[PDB]
Every structure is written in structure tokens, then in C-alpha cells.
């Protein structure tokens, strides 16, 4: 499996040692696959980058840069977590813990940042050694992508506001998004920076094509084919946005470069590529929330 | 009573090794430099 | 000329001893052929 | 266990003092690696022969 | 312990240690003797906010 | 590991065979998934389309088609490379030799690129049998997507020669960390730039929906943040069309229960979000180092693991 053994620090309180015992089956992101790693390297205090604790965007960056490893056995003075990325595909079944909707017999769980749901709920603080652990939520890829887009969608309404996105019905009953209270104010403040990179990359994408199409096809097969299948779609959207907006090949091309990059950087952050699949056997076939679920390395 | 009994089981076996001993003031001390012995070729820096 | 390479057999029966131990990748250019094998390499065989 | 001195005059009288303490162990490990290149594993295990 | 690679397998060796300071009080003292080199140019660079 | 053997055929001189000895860890594109193959199917002479060598946007389209294979070992009469697009299933992590001015870090997805730097470029000629080998340059996807954008736009800007004067912006020069990186500006071919332009134009259209207009309402609101936050200030690049685009609902809501915002995100995210991938070849590998070395120097071997 290639186990990597995280070293618990010096003496921890008895209630903290029982906090870790309950963390078996939880996903950890380990910065390097070194066999011997510290606990402080894994703890959420190690996600600090710009001097701040990362927002939901800063997290999703890190989740794409370090290695998630499921916790297999927690031992006093160790934690044994087996990285998801290493070894052959479809092997090393290690048990997860389900959180929220049921993980049916497949669907490739994505580990998405915690704040998307009850924020501090899952912080799991350890006071004795003064560190904390935020475990990502294991949601299926279709639902994980639906949610993360669902919330930035709700975060665009909120940006300037004067049909509920919140209630997602997922196979069973209805799933609740909003925890009401000020949790939304905490959820919305962390998606704040993800919403903008989304708003920007759209507004910067349209205006950049709406300027380019009329500032191209006027200088062959480009022209004909373009306007051909774009009838009442691109051109109509051109007149309508240019109606409620303003209008340079040299800044155009140099802005088309900087956008094209920033765009794909968001497609990478976003799309929450699945870490694992569920393939069960002699098992329930649906893993009820909070129950260990079998899981295998590639989708 | 019977405290300070401490212990004295054996008396290990010894070898005469090449050391550098100096009396600094009142007491005898190993005087050492140990790079070129352990740290020599290893590309580990010397503490 | 491109070096003929290192002879691995006849390196098994040394004719002498190097009396120093240094990092020789610093002295890299004092030689016609040189290789650093970190642990083991397929080219030894 | 600590010494003590008899003083004289108005003063709080002194009692022997015993301090009991404990320490725990700091835990560590030491790593070193090596490796065999596949041609070597093959010669070594058996088959390239 | 061991694992696969491009090349061939890889054997990491680790043994656990543990340690405690015996004695109450200070047992080691260290002292700086000379300054070898600065390591920093001890110069003129500004800050850019 | 479904390794594909590649036969060195016959005459191979001592200086040419010594050149192939150091090509282990480099990448090959094979035009099939095979077990028996000829050395000449891999050579740059095979990249030649009818009568013509593809340009450096033509190669990306050729590396789009066929399969990247990283050479594992080279034997006297065969070359062993396991086709990453398929046979990536190894327990540990095939070695990729970093050939680039760049440096990998740890976790960086690695997408390949035709050689494109002014100082660099590896083509290894082999005189005994007429053939050559251009090895692609591995590169982090953030950087490899910045390059493709540069080549695309340069082929597009030089396409309709610029009406405006003859002094255009750079677009030929990058920076990765420090280290100015100067791309090779050499030829642009109609067909190679067309498809790259065709699919760029095509996808940026599909990313525009009804709900998109709801977002375009927010441009004046963005510039309100341009100026009162230090972030969001940084977000808007100085050369931002959006900034020039501000220099609205339109009613028309079809029954009110569709959720066009959400649907507009999904639509944009698919087509426009995935442009590095469609314009260029997406990463299939990411640096991972077991020994805990956290970068890969240029010229070193990068332990590499399956897709990011």
C-alpha cells in the first residue's frame, strides 16, 4: 500500500488521543510521500500560505498540490495513512468514512474542502499539542461538482442582490445546503475569493471574444464558418452585451494570453477530479453516512 | 534506609582508543573536532 | 575523443588505494570519464 | 532532597524540602536508503542467466 | 521497508530512537568562538511593498 | 507494464549508439499501441505529413494524436518505453528526465511541449540510419498552457498581418520564477493555426449562455472592487479587456425556474474551463518524489506518478 507513518508529537491529553482514535478512515493530504512525516506538516496550520488561513479557493489549490492519504490505523505515537495516488489503479482497498450523502456502490468520491458544509464542524481541534485537522468531505463527483458550482452560483446572487439553489434532492429525501444562521456569512466569506475568480474569468472571457470575433473575420474560411454556426448565438450575444456594455489587437492578443492561462487554472482547481472509486463486495452497496466504505484508487 | 543502594552489577569490557584528553583547569575533558571523521565526505553540514 | 568508458571489471582487482575521501563531483573536470552512481545503476552491469 | 539551615530570631521556621519530578522520552528515528537497479535485481534474484 | 521505482526497488532503513536529559539543571553549554563569514552582503537593498 | 519494444535496426555506429544511451528517461510518441514496432515510426521523419514537416503548432496537433511513451531502458537491439497513455500501471513511478530550463516542484502535473526555447532544444541526429529524434520538453501544465497560449496568439496575431504599425507586443517571452524564457518564433502554418484558432473560437462561444448575461451585469461591480480591495485589484490584470469593457437583466426570464446562473457556470466550466487540454495535450503525469526531495533540478530524473 506504501504506508506513510505520521508521528504524533510529544505528550497529548487523554481526550485528544481519543479524538485521533476517531479519525481513522479520514482523508489526509500529506505534502510529500516521505515515509516518515510529522503531524504538524499535515495539520491545517500547515496550509497557511500568505500569512492567513486559506479560503475555500486557497484550500482547493492545496488539495490539488499535495497527496491525499486515507488514515488506515491510528496508533498512539503514529498515524498510518496510505496515499491514494501510489500503486496500481483499482487496488489497495482502504476504508473511508462517509460524510453527508450516501456513497453508493460507485461514483468516484471527490474530497472537497470542508467549509462547503458546516464550517467548523469537522475542525477536530487538538489543544494539548495546539494544532487542528480539517478533513475534506468525501462526495461523489457528479454531486461534488454540482455543489461547488451551486454555491458559487449562490455567491454571485449575493455579490449584488436586491428559486432556491440550496435544497438539492439527492436520490434520497432532500439535501440541505444552508445551515442558515451566519454560517452562510462564513460560507459566503470563504467563497468570496472563488466567486471573483469565477466572475472575472467569465466577464473577461466574453468581452475578449466579443471584441475578437468582430475584430477578426474582417481580416477566409475563418469568416464563413464562424458566422455560419454562430447564427443568432455569438453574434446575437455580441449585440446584446455591447448594448449594455462598452466596446485593439495588440492589447487584445496580450490579454487573450493572460486570460487563457487564468481560465485553465480555474478548470484545474475546479472539476474536482476524483481521487478514488467505491467498489464494494459482500457489502451493503450503499454506505450510510458516517459508515466506513470500501474504496479503490482510480475512478 | 537502604536507599542509595543504587547499583553496580558488572564492569564492562574496555578498549584503548585514540582520543585527545586535556585538563582544563581542574578537570579532564575530551577535546574534539569531528568533521573529517564523520562529516568528511558526506555532504552533511557540521553542527 | 569520446571516452572509452569505465572498465568495471579490472576495477574489481585494484592496483592501489585512494588515500583521500572527498566529494569528487567538485573535481568533476580533472577526468576523461566520470559518473556519479547514486546507489546502483543499470550501466554497471 | 534539599539541605536546610537553622535560623535564629523572628522568622518562619524552615522544613526540609523534597522535590519530586519526572521527565518523558523524546522520540526520534534515523533514515538511510539504498537501492538496486533493475538489471541488478535480475542478476541478483536469478533469471538473467 | 521498500518500494518500487524507475530503476529498481528502494530499501529505506529507519530505526527509532528516544532520549532524555539526565540531570537537573544545565548539562551542556555552548559558546560561539569566531565569525567565519557574513553570508549576507550587509548592504543597500530597499523594500518594495 | 505493457512495454512497447522499439528495434534499433542494424547499423548503428558507436557514436550514435552512445547518443541513444543517454536518451533514457525521455519521451517518445508512437503511432499505435504495439508490441512490435520499427525505430522509424518514432522518428521525426514520421511526424512529416504529406511532403511537409509540421511547424511547432503542427507538432502539438501531432502529439495530440499518437501516444507519449517515456523511455525506461535502452538495449542493444530494442528501446523499451511503456505507453503512459495506457501502461502507466506501475506500483511505483516511472522516471522522467527533466529536459527544460524549468523545474518541476512536487505535485506539478507534467504536460509535454515540442522543443520551444531559444536556448535549449534537443534533437539528436543519428547518421548511420537516416533518422532523428526530437524529444518533447516536459513542463508544468501552468507553464505549458502559458506557452501554447503564446504560440496560438502569435499565430493569430501574425495571421492578419497587423493595419496597425509593424511593432507588436512581445508574446514570445515568458517568465517562470525568475529566468526570462524566450520562445522560438519561426513559422506559422495556415492549417496548424486554423485548427488552433478554430477550436479556440468554437469553445469560447459555447461558454456563453442565457445566464451569462446575468454575469455581464457585474462588470461595473467588479471595477468597484478593482479599487477598494488589494485583491480583486490584483485579479484584474493591468491589460484587462474587462477594464476596457466598462469604459442589464433584460427581463426575459423564462418562467423563473431554470437557475441560469448555475447552468451558465457548468456550461462555461466545460467548454472554456478546459481549454489548455483541448488546445494542447493535458497532463498525464505529476511529479512525485518518494525520497522527499521536493523539486527536480533541470536535467535530473523526475519520479513521476499517474494523472493529477
mmCIF file with all atom_site columns, N, CA and C in Angstrom, chain F residues 117-158:
data_model
loop_
_atom_site.group_PDB
_atom_site.id
_atom_site.type_symbol
_atom_site.label_atom_id
_atom_site.label_alt_id
_atom_site.label_comp_id
_atom_site.label_asym_id
_atom_site.label_entity_id
_atom_site.label_seq_id
_atom_site.pdbx_PDB_ins_code
_atom_site.Cartn_x
_atom_site.Cartn_y
_atom_site.Cartn_z
_atom_site.occupancy
_atom_site.B_iso_or_equiv
_atom_site.pdbx_formal_charge
_atom_site.auth_seq_id
_atom_site.auth_comp_id
_atom_site.auth_asym_id
_atom_site.auth_atom_id
_atom_site.pdbx_PDB_model_num
ATOM 1   N N  . UNK F 1 117 ? 12.279 26.600 -26.804 1.00 0.00 ? 117 UNK F N  1
ATOM 2   C CA . UNK F 1 117 ? 13.059 27.664 -26.183 1.00 0.00 ? 117 UNK F CA 1
ATOM 3   C C  . UNK F 1 117 ? 14.245 28.035 -27.033 1.00 0.00 ? 117 UNK F C  1
ATOM 4   N N  . UNK F 1 118 ? 14.625 29.308 -27.012 1.00 0.00 ? 118 UNK F N  1
ATOM 5   C CA . UNK F 1 118 ? 15.734 29.794 -27.820 1.00 0.00 ? 118 UNK F CA 1
ATOM 6   C C  . UNK F 1 118 ? 17.042 29.138 -27.411 1.00 0.00 ? 118 UNK F C  1
ATOM 7   N N  . UNK F 1 119 ? 17.282 29.050 -26.113 1.00 0.00 ? 119 UNK F N  1
ATOM 8   C CA . UNK F 1 119 ? 18.481 28.393 -25.647 1.00 0.00 ? 119 UNK F CA 1
ATOM 9   C C  . UNK F 1 119 ? 17.992 27.088 -25.064 1.00 0.00 ? 119 UNK F C  1
ATOM 10  N N  . UNK F 1 120 ? 18.256 26.014 -25.798 1.00 0.00 ? 120 UNK F N  1
ATOM 11  C CA . UNK F 1 120 ? 17.858 24.647 -25.481 1.00 0.00 ? 120 UNK F CA 1
ATOM 12  C C  . UNK F 1 120 ? 17.545 24.036 -26.828 1.00 0.00 ? 120 UNK F C  1
ATOM 13  N N  . UNK F 1 121 ? 16.669 23.037 -26.822 1.00 0.00 ? 121 UNK F N  1
ATOM 14  C CA . UNK F 1 121 ? 16.199 22.309 -27.999 1.00 0.00 ? 121 UNK F CA 1
ATOM 15  C C  . UNK F 1 121 ? 17.001 21.047 -28.203 1.00 0.00 ? 121 UNK F C  1
ATOM 16  N N  . UNK F 1 122 ? 16.378 19.899 -27.968 1.00 0.00 ? 122 UNK F N  1
ATOM 17  C CA . UNK F 1 122 ? 17.099 18.657 -28.157 1.00 0.00 ? 122 UNK F CA 1
ATOM 18  C C  . UNK F 1 122 ? 16.566 17.880 -29.338 1.00 0.00 ? 122 UNK F C  1
ATOM 19  N N  . UNK F 1 123 ? 17.429 17.690 -30.322 1.00 0.00 ? 123 UNK F N  1
ATOM 20  C CA . UNK F 1 123 ? 17.131 16.912 -31.499 1.00 0.00 ? 123 UNK F CA 1
ATOM 21  C C  . UNK F 1 123 ? 18.392 16.117 -31.476 1.00 0.00 ? 123 UNK F C  1
ATOM 22  N N  . UNK F 1 124 ? 18.325 14.808 -31.626 1.00 0.00 ? 124 UNK F N  1
ATOM 23  C CA . UNK F 1 124 ? 19.563 14.062 -31.594 1.00 0.00 ? 124 UNK F CA 1
ATOM 24  C C  . UNK F 1 124 ? 19.610 13.358 -32.929 1.00 0.00 ? 124 UNK F C  1
ATOM 25  N N  . UNK F 1 125 ? 20.594 13.707 -33.745 1.00 0.00 ? 125 UNK F N  1
ATOM 26  C CA . UNK F 1 125 ? 20.736 13.118 -35.065 1.00 0.00 ? 125 UNK F CA 1
ATOM 27  C C  . UNK F 1 125 ? 21.438 11.784 -35.022 1.00 0.00 ? 125 UNK F C  1
ATOM 28  N N  . UNK F 1 126 ? 21.090 10.896 -35.947 1.00 0.00 ? 126 UNK F N  1
ATOM 29  C CA . UNK F 1 126 ? 21.722 9.586  -35.986 1.00 0.00 ? 126 UNK F CA 1
ATOM 30  C C  . UNK F 1 126 ? 22.072 9.318  -37.437 1.00 0.00 ? 126 UNK F C  1
ATOM 31  N N  . UNK F 1 127 ? 23.365 9.329  -37.756 1.00 0.00 ? 127 UNK F N  1
ATOM 32  C CA . UNK F 1 127 ? 23.792 9.349  -39.150 1.00 0.00 ? 127 UNK F CA 1
ATOM 33  C C  . UNK F 1 127 ? 23.748 7.970  -39.797 1.00 0.00 ? 127 UNK F C  1
ATOM 34  N N  . UNK F 1 128 ? 23.982 6.896  -39.049 1.00 0.00 ? 128 UNK F N  1
ATOM 35  C CA . UNK F 1 128 ? 24.007 5.576  -39.688 1.00 0.00 ? 128 UNK F CA 1
ATOM 36  C C  . UNK F 1 128 ? 22.708 5.286  -40.395 1.00 0.00 ? 128 UNK F C  1
ATOM 37  N N  . UNK F 1 129 ? 21.577 5.541  -39.774 1.00 0.00 ? 129 UNK F N  1
ATOM 38  C CA . UNK F 1 129 ? 20.332 5.303  -40.467 1.00 0.00 ? 129 UNK F CA 1
ATOM 39  C C  . UNK F 1 129 ? 19.580 6.601  -40.507 1.00 0.00 ? 129 UNK F C  1
ATOM 40  N N  . UNK F 1 130 ? 19.161 7.013  -41.673 1.00 0.00 ? 130 UNK F N  1
ATOM 41  C CA . UNK F 1 130 ? 18.614 8.306  -41.649 1.00 0.00 ? 130 UNK F CA 1
ATOM 42  C C  . UNK F 1 130 ? 17.386 8.425  -40.818 1.00 0.00 ? 130 UNK F C  1
ATOM 43  N N  . UNK F 1 131 ? 17.600 9.021  -39.657 1.00 0.00 ? 131 UNK F N  1
ATOM 44  C CA . UNK F 1 131 ? 16.526 9.433  -38.763 1.00 0.00 ? 131 UNK F CA 1
ATOM 45  C C  . UNK F 1 131 ? 16.965 10.295 -37.614 1.00 0.00 ? 131 UNK F C  1
ATOM 46  N N  . UNK F 1 132 ? 16.024 11.013 -37.026 1.00 0.00 ? 132 UNK F N  1
ATOM 47  C CA . UNK F 1 132 ? 16.330 11.938 -35.957 1.00 0.00 ? 132 UNK F CA 1
ATOM 48  C C  . UNK F 1 132 ? 15.361 11.790 -34.815 1.00 0.00 ? 132 UNK F C  1
ATOM 49  N N  . UNK F 1 133 ? 15.580 12.480 -33.704 1.00 0.00 ? 133 UNK F N  1
ATOM 50  C CA . UNK F 1 133 ? 14.590 12.321 -32.650 1.00 0.00 ? 133 UNK F CA 1
ATOM 51  C C  . UNK F 1 133 ? 14.465 13.655 -31.933 1.00 0.00 ? 133 UNK F C  1
ATOM 52  N N  . UNK F 1 134 ? 13.315 14.300 -32.032 1.00 0.00 ? 134 UNK F N  1
ATOM 53  C CA . UNK F 1 134 ? 13.068 15.484 -31.229 1.00 0.00 ? 134 UNK F CA 1
ATOM 54  C C  . UNK F 1 134 ? 12.345 15.078 -29.962 1.00 0.00 ? 134 UNK F C  1
ATOM 55  N N  . UNK F 1 135 ? 12.940 15.340 -28.877 1.00 0.00 ? 135 UNK F N  1
ATOM 56  C CA . UNK F 1 135 ? 12.226 14.914 -27.702 1.00 0.00 ? 135 UNK F CA 1
ATOM 57  C C  . UNK F 1 135 ? 11.422 16.066 -27.151 1.00 0.00 ? 135 UNK F C  1
ATOM 58  N N  . UNK F 1 136 ? 10.162 15.839 -26.809 1.00 0.00 ? 136 UNK F N  1
ATOM 59  C CA . UNK F 1 136 ? 9.351  16.911 -26.248 1.00 0.00 ? 136 UNK F CA 1
ATOM 60  C C  . UNK F 1 136 ? 9.931  17.397 -24.936 1.00 0.00 ? 136 UNK F C  1
ATOM 61  N N  . UNK F 1 137 ? 9.597  18.633 -24.595 1.00 0.00 ? 137 UNK F N  1
ATOM 62  C CA . UNK F 1 137 ? 10.054 19.254 -23.357 1.00 0.00 ? 137 UNK F CA 1
ATOM 63  C C  . UNK F 1 137 ? 8.968  19.054 -22.305 1.00 0.00 ? 137 UNK F C  1
ATOM 64  N N  . UNK F 1 138 ? 9.221  18.297 -21.244 1.00 0.00 ? 138 UNK F N  1
ATOM 65  C CA . UNK F 1 138 ? 8.287  18.269 -20.127 1.00 0.00 ? 138 UNK F CA 1
ATOM 66  C C  . UNK F 1 138 ? 8.277  19.614 -19.425 1.00 0.00 ? 138 UNK F C  1
ATOM 67  N N  . UNK F 1 139 ? 7.157  19.914 -18.794 1.00 0.00 ? 139 UNK F N  1
ATOM 68  C CA . UNK F 1 139 ? 6.873  21.261 -18.309 1.00 0.00 ? 139 UNK F CA 1
ATOM 69  C C  . UNK F 1 139 ? 5.618  21.238 -17.456 1.00 0.00 ? 139 UNK F C  1
ATOM 70  N N  . UNK F 1 140 ? 5.565  22.026 -16.393 1.00 0.00 ? 140 UNK F N  1
ATOM 71  C CA . UNK F 1 140 ? 4.345  22.098 -15.598 1.00 0.00 ? 140 UNK F CA 1
ATOM 72  C C  . UNK F 1 140 ? 3.203  22.584 -16.467 1.00 0.00 ? 140 UNK F C  1
ATOM 73  N N  . UNK F 1 141 ? 2.017  22.028 -16.248 1.00 0.00 ? 141 UNK F N  1
ATOM 74  C CA . UNK F 1 141 ? 0.868  22.488 -17.016 1.00 0.00 ? 141 UNK F CA 1
ATOM 75  C C  . UNK F 1 141 ? 0.600  23.982 -16.886 1.00 0.00 ? 141 UNK F C  1
ATOM 76  N N  . UNK F 1 142 ? 0.794  24.637 -15.736 1.00 0.00 ? 142 UNK F N  1
ATOM 77  C CA . UNK F 1 142 ? 0.676  26.098 -15.732 1.00 0.00 ? 142 UNK F CA 1
ATOM 78  C C  . UNK F 1 142 ? 1.562  26.760 -16.756 1.00 0.00 ? 142 UNK F C  1
ATOM 79  N N  . UNK F 1 143 ? 2.805  26.299 -16.881 1.00 0.00 ? 143 UNK F N  1
ATOM 80  C CA . UNK F 1 143 ? 3.717  26.901 -17.840 1.00 0.00 ? 143 UNK F CA 1
ATOM 81  C C  . UNK F 1 143 ? 3.436  26.419 -19.253 1.00 0.00 ? 143 UNK F C  1
ATOM 82  N N  . UNK F 1 144 ? 3.156  25.133 -19.428 1.00 0.00 ? 144 UNK F N  1
ATOM 83  C CA . UNK F 1 144 ? 2.880  24.632 -20.764 1.00 0.00 ? 144 UNK F CA 1
ATOM 84  C C  . UNK F 1 144 ? 1.616  25.228 -21.351 1.00 0.00 ? 144 UNK F C  1
ATOM 85  N N  . UNK F 1 145 ? 0.657  25.613 -20.517 1.00 0.00 ? 145 UNK F N  1
ATOM 86  C CA . UNK F 1 145 ? -0.534 26.279 -21.026 1.00 0.00 ? 145 UNK F CA 1
ATOM 87  C C  . UNK F 1 145 ? -0.293 27.751 -21.308 1.00 0.00 ? 145 UNK F C  1
ATOM 88  N N  . UNK F 1 146 ? 0.647  28.376 -20.604 1.00 0.00 ? 146 UNK F N  1
ATOM 89  C CA . UNK F 1 146 ? 1.013  29.742 -20.955 1.00 0.00 ? 146 UNK F CA 1
ATOM 90  C C  . UNK F 1 146 ? 1.717  29.779 -22.297 1.00 0.00 ? 146 UNK F C  1
ATOM 91  N N  . UNK F 1 147 ? 2.545  28.774 -22.580 1.00 0.00 ? 147 UNK F N  1
ATOM 92  C CA . UNK F 1 147 ? 3.269  28.726 -23.845 1.00 0.00 ? 147 UNK F CA 1
ATOM 93  C C  . UNK F 1 147 ? 2.312  28.538 -25.005 1.00 0.00 ? 147 UNK F C  1
ATOM 94  N N  . UNK F 1 148 ? 1.449  27.531 -24.920 1.00 0.00 ? 148 UNK F N  1
ATOM 95  C CA . UNK F 1 148 ? 0.523  27.277 -26.014 1.00 0.00 ? 148 UNK F CA 1
ATOM 96  C C  . UNK F 1 148 ? -0.286 28.523 -26.319 1.00 0.00 ? 148 UNK F C  1
ATOM 97  N N  . UNK F 1 149 ? -0.755 29.209 -25.278 1.00 0.00 ? 149 UNK F N  1
ATOM 98  C CA . UNK F 1 149 ? -1.436 30.479 -25.485 1.00 0.00 ? 149 UNK F CA 1
ATOM 99  C C  . UNK F 1 149 ? -0.557 31.453 -26.256 1.00 0.00 ? 149 UNK F C  1
ATOM 100 N N  . UNK F 1 150 ? 0.741  31.483 -25.954 1.00 0.00 ? 150 UNK F N  1
ATOM 101 C CA . UNK F 1 150 ? 1.637  32.380 -26.670 1.00 0.00 ? 150 UNK F CA 1
ATOM 102 C C  . UNK F 1 150 ? 1.734  31.992 -28.135 1.00 0.00 ? 150 UNK F C  1
ATOM 103 N N  . UNK F 1 151 ? 1.895  30.700 -28.412 1.00 0.00 ? 151 UNK F N  1
ATOM 104 C CA . UNK F 1 151 ? 2.020  30.260 -29.797 1.00 0.00 ? 151 UNK F CA 1
ATOM 105 C C  . UNK F 1 151 ? 0.722  30.461 -30.553 1.00 0.00 ? 151 UNK F C  1
ATOM 106 N N  . UNK F 1 152 ? -0.407 30.188 -29.904 1.00 0.00 ? 152 UNK F N  1
ATOM 107 C CA . UNK F 1 152 ? -1.699 30.388 -30.549 1.00 0.00 ? 152 UNK F CA 1
ATOM 108 C C  . UNK F 1 152 ? -1.876 31.849 -30.924 1.00 0.00 ? 152 UNK F C  1
ATOM 109 N N  . UNK F 1 153 ? -1.758 32.740 -29.941 1.00 0.00 ? 153 UNK F N  1
ATOM 110 C CA . UNK F 1 153 ? -1.964 34.155 -30.205 1.00 0.00 ? 153 UNK F CA 1
ATOM 111 C C  . UNK F 1 153 ? -0.959 34.689 -31.214 1.00 0.00 ? 153 UNK F C  1
ATOM 112 N N  . UNK F 1 154 ? 0.292  34.230 -31.149 1.00 0.00 ? 154 UNK F N  1
ATOM 113 C CA . UNK F 1 154 ? 1.279  34.704 -32.108 1.00 0.00 ? 154 UNK F CA 1
ATOM 114 C C  . UNK F 1 154 ? 0.916  34.274 -33.517 1.00 0.00 ? 154 UNK F C  1
ATOM 115 N N  . UNK F 1 155 ? 0.465  33.033 -33.681 1.00 0.00 ? 155 UNK F N  1
ATOM 116 C CA . UNK F 1 155 ? -0.025 32.608 -34.979 1.00 0.00 ? 155 UNK F CA 1
ATOM 117 C C  . UNK F 1 155 ? -1.281 33.340 -35.398 1.00 0.00 ? 155 UNK F C  1
ATOM 118 N N  . UNK F 1 156 ? -2.085 33.770 -34.433 1.00 0.00 ? 156 UNK F N  1
ATOM 119 C CA . UNK F 1 156 ? -3.272 34.550 -34.747 1.00 0.00 ? 156 UNK F CA 1
ATOM 120 C C  . UNK F 1 156 ? -2.913 36.006 -34.989 1.00 0.00 ? 156 UNK F C  1
ATOM 121 N N  . UNK F 1 157 ? -2.050 36.604 -34.183 1.00 0.00 ? 157 UNK F N  1
ATOM 122 C CA . UNK F 1 157 ? -1.734 37.998 -34.471 1.00 0.00 ? 157 UNK F CA 1
ATOM 123 C C  . UNK F 1 157 ? -1.001 38.133 -35.814 1.00 0.00 ? 157 UNK F C  1
ATOM 124 N N  . UNK F 1 158 ? 0.008  37.303 -36.073 1.00 0.00 ? 158 UNK F N  1
ATOM 125 C CA . UNK F 1 158 ? 0.660  37.349 -37.372 1.00 0.00 ? 158 UNK F CA 1
ATOM 126 C C  . UNK F 1 158 ? -0.226 36.839 -38.498 1.00 0.00 ? 158 UNK F C  1
#
